[model samples]
Target: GRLGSPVVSERMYPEDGALKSEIKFGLRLKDGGHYAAEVKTTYKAKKPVQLPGAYIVDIKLDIVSHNEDYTIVEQCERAEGRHSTGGMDELYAIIKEFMRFKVHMEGSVNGHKFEIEGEGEGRPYEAFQTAKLKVTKGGPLPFAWDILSPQFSKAYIKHPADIPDYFKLSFPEGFRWERVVNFEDGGIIHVNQDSSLQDGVFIYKVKLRGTNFPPDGPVMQKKTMGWEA
Candidate 1:
């Protein structure tokens, strides 16, 4: 069967440590709903060798399309939940590595348009941690995200808190997800952070955990998520 309700958040990629980081989504849609998505990304990390031929440092994005035809952007839906294990296992990215990506439409939801978009960096330097999109009423329903897991261009180590708000995604007034995420007593969100640069840009990862998942249910994964984006 399909899934139930809407709830979301983002988590970084891989359980261990590495230079490349990724954040994924979780979204659900209801009938006769409306939604829009908007995204922006910027990246910077230092790889001196490439000053001439090194890999470029930057954040890039792609909003999955609705199918073999129509286009979608500034709005997305029927999304799946993607996270880095939702806890201490969240947020891990190293430097000197980069990423390239492509997006695909999620299956039809509530008979409306739906999809997923993603942002990642390639090779060297730092990145701007920001929301690459938005989803809500006048629209379908869904919960959370991890925004961007950026590798900064620092040459030294600093406290995780030492990282500025600049390292985290900033949503407009009511557009932020924290305002809508809720958890039951047994349901909890555990946050953790870490960063790296090796010899290039500083990479930072943030894992935002939001779930309505029951702790004792055998169906630990509410939605089987048969599609890919």
Candidate 2:
């Protein structure tokens, strides 16, 4: 898959004193797959460095065409019972790390739109159960936070609670998977932060642990079933 040249536009408002940018692009995938995407981001800084002070407020991924075998319908159907919130991992990280105000990430994928927010009554930073995915056909479904595995939440860890060495993960009925993403560590910094300037601009390390998986155990001997040439 390849992304077409993105068309960008920017503007600033005097009242809010924030910069908003709109990026329009098309995704062209092989096997007759195509998608048109539009992303709107707001920044606190006059010139944002992609991550710092940037908030992806809106995103729309419209499926214009798709391959027959690898269609979104099939994907959603397969994902219907899969108990994994890996897709929204980055969104959770962004919310915890960059979000300063109470913001809702409005997003749409192939006509399925949803509004996601953080922190509500009894919903502390550690326990995030407010965010929901409202599908067009189905009722509201929890997306970001996993109450079953609270440790897997991408929310920032201030004073991480103590837990056992190993925990149990309940998978959906008939769910079989080989690899499981342990966590998405967005970044870690001192609670009491300090700042510095580089290249005449303030720079901060995101220090993202984007994704992690379990360490492989002892290897075993395998047999080659297929005939060798």
Candidate 3:
């Protein structure tokens, strides 16, 4: 029952960016004749932007760590699946980002070294959902990630949407489905930009990962848009 701890999971603000699952794990031989290691990571997947809903991005993860015949290595395999929501988005993100699992076994079978590499779909990161910040629908919706980033970059859509008559959505990665429907029609978006991107009115869904986020999030998406640092 030891699920280990997180070491580097993060989701930036304004959540609209192309961020595939970034997973990097490796092992090293030590002077003590045993093996020590870390879980380094980076992006993996073909989905553009955040999970708009029902998109299938093929992702394969093969990791292992155990002891037998004088060796131990951690292991995992999450093959081919896409998550379009953030219910538990940070489930792995937080656990992976906040802890570093060191598998050091000097038993008879603990003598191997290796590496493993990488989630989207249906609420995989909703640590702080149901909370939100209300912004000017047609105006600027600025935000920041409180976890592990602080900088200012700029990007502008040539034809911005009309926010007043629509909803403006901003959140951290893995904090999926803020009480909004993923599609205008009964059918959900199962693919890329063509279908899910335009299914909203004035609502800009920011797919934030590996960066900062709005200050009012992780609170069940309050939608109040105001928090003090």
Candidate 4:
């Protein structure tokens, strides 16, 4: 496959008032059967060099293959560190010692393949490090939300206390539950039966699980006789 040139982003730096840390890197990827990438980073001293500091740098890469089907093919990351009090040259030397990286690839025949590669460096005296990434792909990637329709609804219940009974009878194996309160309708209660973050929507397989059932009166009735969210 003809993998195009890698896309690069800006290198981040520490704040002016910060006492420690510095970093820089330029990334490039070339096609070789699959793809190979290189990251070059430079480090700088925080103070006059008489003071001490430990420079630690880490690099990680995440590859997503989006050919016939979308999938993650590889992930690699490593960390290293060094202690020194020195000028720009010495700082650069420390950075050189701690700077390390690796590459990974995945796929079968032809698929939508892409890579997210980045580098991060931290100075002991600073709270954060400079971070950057380079993304390269074989072709346009698929975004699930764009192709999927949104699911929306407003639900109500005819009975609240019967929720537990409904769940005991209908709850599927491997299912979880949560309690929710809606203030708009005099604090109605619903038990979330199934919820996950896999998609943007908060999917809840739920049932009413609260008090306020009619006192053994005819007015008390169960609607639908099942769980709904």
| Global lDDT of each candidate | 0.25, 0.21, 0.19, 0.24
Ranking by lDDT: 1, 4, 2, 3
Model 1 per-residue lDDT tens digits across residues 122-152: 3322332222322222123221122111111
Give the per-residue lDDT digits (tens) of candidate 4, residues 25-63: 221212112111122222222122222223333222223
Q: Choose the strongest candidate by TM-score.
A: 1
Tell me how many clashing residue pairs each candidate has.
Answer: 32, 0, 84, 3
Overall local distance difference test of candidate 3: 0.19
Tell how far residue 109 is off in model 1, in angstroms: 27
For model 4 the local lDDT of residue 177 reads 33
Stronger candidate by TM-score (1 vs 3): 1
Measured against the true structure, the TM-scores of the candidates, in listed sequence, are 0.24, 0.21, 0.17, 0.21
Overlapping backbone residue pairs in candidate 3 total 84
Q: What does candidate 2's lDDT look like per residue over 7-112, in tens digits? A: 1222111124333434343223333333333333332322221221222211111112223321111000000011123346532211222211121223322233
Candidate 4 stretches with Cα past 4 Å from truth are 1-22, 31-54, 58-73, 84-229
Q: How far is candidate 2 from the true structure (C-alpha RMSD, Å)?
A: 21.8
Candidates by TM-score, descending order = 1, 2, 4, 3
lDDT of 4: 0.24
Identify the leading candidate in terms of lDDT. 1
